[PDB]
Design a binder for this molecule. Structure first.
Ligand SMILES: [Zn+2]
Ligand SMILES: [Zn+2]
Ligand SMILES: [Zn+2]
Length: 85
DNA sequence: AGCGTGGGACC
DNA sequence: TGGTCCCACGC
């Protein structure tokens, strides 16, 4: 919690100094990761990785119940719960 | 659905 | 630093 965002208009606080560094990019608008397929810029390398799958169609996450594939684990997570009742 | 994207964590 | 998951939330 000791790490406050220096931007004046912003008052968000962070427990980890590094979580502030990432956060600073929201204010600086820095997007240092580019998709070589569509040239779009992204603020995070991990977000670029999952974005690229929208081009290749790579879906490494399969639902345990029906086997349906998803590009992201969170999409699979959101899906799996539909099998309930 | 499709998928951007920030915060927390872990390495 | 900086890479990479999970999470969550949003549209
Ligand atoms: Zn801030
Ligand atoms: Zn792209
Ligand atoms: Zn399923």
């Amino acid at each position: 919690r000791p790490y406050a965002c220096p931007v004046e208009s912003c008052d968000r606080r962070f427990s980890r100094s590094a979580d502030l560094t990432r956060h600073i990019r929201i204010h600086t608008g820095q997007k240092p990761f580019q998709c070589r397929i569509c040239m779009r810029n992204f603020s995070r390398s991990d977000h670029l990785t999952t974005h690229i799958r929208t081009h290749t169609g790579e879906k490494p996450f399969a639902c345990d119940i029906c086997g349906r594939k998803f590009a992201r684990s969170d999409e699979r997570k959101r899906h799996t719960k539909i099998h309930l009742r």
